[PDB]
Design an enzyme around this catalytic site. Structure first.
Site, PDB file in Angstrom:
ATOM      1  N   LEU A 234       0.866  -1.171   0.000  1.00  0.00           N
ATOM      2  CA  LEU A 234       0.000   0.000   0.000  1.00  0.00           C
ATOM      3  C   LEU A 234       0.897   1.213   0.000  1.00  0.00           C
ATOM      4  O   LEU A 234       2.093   1.072   0.290  1.00  0.00           O
ATOM      5  CB  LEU A 234      -0.996  -0.016   1.147  1.00  0.00           C
ATOM      6  CG  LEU A 234      -1.799  -1.314   1.376  1.00  0.00           C
ATOM      7  CD1 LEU A 234      -2.702  -1.177   2.610  1.00  0.00           C
ATOM      8  CD2 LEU A 234      -2.647  -1.562   0.087  1.00  0.00           C
ATOM      9  N   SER A 235       0.352   2.394  -0.314  1.00  0.00           N
ATOM     10  CA  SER A 235       1.189   3.600  -0.385  1.00  0.00           C
ATOM     11  C   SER A 235       1.975   3.801   0.926  1.00  0.00           C
ATOM     12  O   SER A 235       3.119   4.285   0.884  1.00  0.00           O
ATOM     13  CB  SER A 235       0.353   4.848  -0.666  1.00  0.00           C
ATOM     14  OG  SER A 235      -0.143   4.824  -2.035  1.00  0.00           O
ATOM     15  N   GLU A 236       1.333   3.487   2.056  1.00  0.00           N
ATOM     16  CA  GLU A 236       2.013   3.422   3.370  1.00  0.00           C
ATOM     17  C   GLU A 236       1.392   2.371   4.268  1.00  0.00           C
ATOM     18  O   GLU A 236       0.205   2.089   4.168  1.00  0.00           O
ATOM     19  CB  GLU A 236       1.940   4.745   4.118  1.00  0.00           C
ATOM     20  CG  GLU A 236       2.973   5.812   3.690  1.00  0.00           C
ATOM     21  CD  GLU A 236       2.387   6.805   2.710  1.00  0.00           C
ATOM     22  OE1 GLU A 236       1.233   6.587   2.219  1.00  0.00           O
ATOM     23  OE2 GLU A 236       3.102   7.761   2.358  1.00  0.00           O
ATOM     24  N   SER A 237       2.232   1.808   5.161  1.00  0.00           N
ATOM     25  CA  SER A 237       1.808   1.118   6.358  1.00  0.00           C
ATOM     26  C   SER A 237       2.377   1.888   7.591  1.00  0.00           C
ATOM     27  O   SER A 237       3.411   2.550   7.499  1.00  0.00           O
ATOM     28  CB  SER A 237       2.306  -0.297   6.407  1.00  0.00           C
ATOM     29  OG  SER A 237       1.828  -1.046   5.262  1.00  0.00           O
TER      30      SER A 237
ATOM     31  N   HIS B 244      -2.555  11.095   4.965  1.00  0.00           N
ATOM     32  CA  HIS B 244      -3.388   9.865   4.863  1.00  0.00           C
ATOM     33  C   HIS B 244      -3.076   8.780   5.875  1.00  0.00           C
ATOM     34  O   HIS B 244      -3.990   8.306   6.489  1.00  0.00           O
ATOM     35  CB  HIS B 244      -3.555   9.413   3.361  1.00  0.00           C
ATOM     36  CG  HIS B 244      -3.097   8.022   3.033  1.00  0.00           C
ATOM     37  ND1 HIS B 244      -1.809   7.744   2.674  1.00  0.00           N
ATOM     38  CD2 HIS B 244      -3.774   6.858   2.943  1.00  0.00           C
ATOM     39  CE1 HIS B 244      -1.697   6.445   2.421  1.00  0.00           C
ATOM     40  NE2 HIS B 244      -2.867   5.873   2.638  1.00  0.00           N
TER      41      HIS B 244
END
Ligand SMILES: N[C@H]1C(C(=O)O)=CC=C[C@@H]1O
Ligand SMILES: N[C@H]1C(C(=O)O)=CC=C[C@@H]1O
EC number: 5.3.3.17
Lengths: 278, 279
Positions: free
Chosen positions: B44-47, B75
């Site tokens: 994902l774009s970030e964790s 986000h």
């Protein structure tokens, strides 16, 4: 609400291999929704386990973030390892849009460690776009003729003269987007041990960790171009540069004009398990 | 060793919209090198990773893209706040980061956190000074406003487009953009209280991000600086349409250019899934 498991396919320890999310009891989901869930998960593929329609144990639909595929190696490997936990069987038959794929499961004390599949026998032809592709990849020549193989998806093979040259590739992804409905597989190695890297804008991935539907075709490619014997097992190591080392085992039996079997196998392990709200 | 996680779709009221973040609870036993590997596994774009607090907040949060750690991001922290909001009755939450403690106000409906608002770090900014190179990479010939880069932990460049059609028509060269290190390229179009964005960042491991919360605050400032809105005027920024992940961010920047007193970003979020991992 659907249960899912994350399997690391073509790996013997979590965080190696290529993840797939395998969704259970998916009969209530419309295909447009399956595609959205695949987009949500953002892994190279998510799969959906459905009741069988043609005598298999189950029907599996396979989605990238952007499209559906009729066949794929890593996702079906992981699906077979996940589903193996449901029964005691060591033979499993999974239906796909390319037909029913036979699996043999490696189990210890009932616990699944690995699996082996018989893939569809691919066809092939010359790409006919060498200069375009090699420019996009940022190189001069392929070590072997550039051919495109079809077993559902399509896979092009470009040979590199050393593992260092393979690792140094920095392709133009936007230029590779002109190559529709295919994945670009660049390879290097010797004898029984080969390395690979795969790039596919068409299939929604900058670089994939383990392209299992490419492993069987590569074994064919290597034998047709005299670098190994038909029937000789090979190891193909993919995903090293991106930190996702994945070990695929492949063997193509018969001869160029008449192949009798295209076997791809690997280990897989569970990374996690959970439930989604729809 | 095992860790529970929730998937929050940030800047959305329904699942499958907004920008997903994976939030890992009780993460103190994971070394940063293993956190980075988990973030790549999730893709994902970030964790984010929830650690015990060290400076009087509620928790300390570490944030990872698929390829690097970031000291702040919008986000992922919104989603983290909504997720942690399920475990408390408090109206505010204080999340420590490498940028300092970020204050959140949580909004509940029935028994349930449905949204939150954050006060972001006040950014610095300058021109990027590489207009020719950047515009070439984007495939266009100029920007509607001065091309400037803002820093609130990560860095965000803004390039203005003359219409939404022109914005949707962008097909950037990801490879050429990779020569822009430690930043994201935010392209914008719209008018008044309504703006559309697209974000591209090989540096942060994403071809195109669905909702760049750390860019919403700076864009409000940029629009005010360039006389398109007034300071203190709330705007709506819609991101992710072209990639099928529409995400609505609300932002307001208060004060004046020489002295910003608050840069607020807010949004809805919703749980898509949850589970457990084997390390
Ligand atoms: N995992 C790959 C695949 C495979 O066979 O594993 C087929 C096509 C593209 C996917 O990224
Ligand atoms: N979601 C983005 C982020 C953010 O603030 O949300 C910052 C940097 C890159 C990520 O893709």
């Amino acid at each position: 609400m659907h249960n899912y498991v994350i399997i690391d396919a073509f790996a013997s320890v979590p965080l190696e291999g290529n993840p797939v999310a395998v969704f259970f009891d998916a009969d209530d989901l419309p295909p447009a929704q399956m595609q959205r869930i695949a987009r949500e998960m953002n892994l190279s593929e998510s799969t959906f386990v459905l009741k069988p329609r043609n005598g298999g144990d189950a029907l599996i639909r396979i989605f990238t973030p952007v499209n559906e595929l009729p066949f794929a190696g890593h996702p079906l490997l992981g699906t077979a390892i996940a589903l193996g936990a449901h029964t005691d069987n060591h033979r499993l038959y999974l239906e796909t849009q390319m037909g029913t794929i036979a699996f043999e499961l490696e189990r210890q004390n009932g616990s699944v460690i690995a699996a082996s599949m018989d893939q569809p026998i691919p066809t092939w032809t010359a790409l006919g776009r060498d200069a375009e592709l090699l420019k996009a990849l940022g190189i001069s020549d392929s070590t072997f003729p550039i051919e495109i193989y079809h077993n559902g998806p399509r896979h092009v093979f470009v040979g590199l003269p050393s593992i260092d040259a393979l690792s140094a590739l920095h392709p133009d992804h936007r230029a590779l987007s002109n190559f529709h409905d295919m994945a670009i597989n660049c390879f290097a190695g010797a004898g029984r041990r080969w390395r690979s890297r795969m790039f596919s804008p068409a299939y929604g991935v900058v670089e994939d960790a383990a392209t299992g539907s490419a492993a069987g075709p590569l074994a064919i490619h290597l034998a047709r171009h005299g670098q190994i014997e038909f029937g000789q097992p090979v190891e193909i190591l993919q995903g090293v540069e991106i930190g996702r080392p994945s070990l695929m085992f492949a063997k193509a039996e018969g001869r160029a004009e008449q192949l009798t079997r295209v076997e791809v196998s690997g280990n897989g392990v569970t990374f996690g398990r959970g439930t989604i709200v729809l």
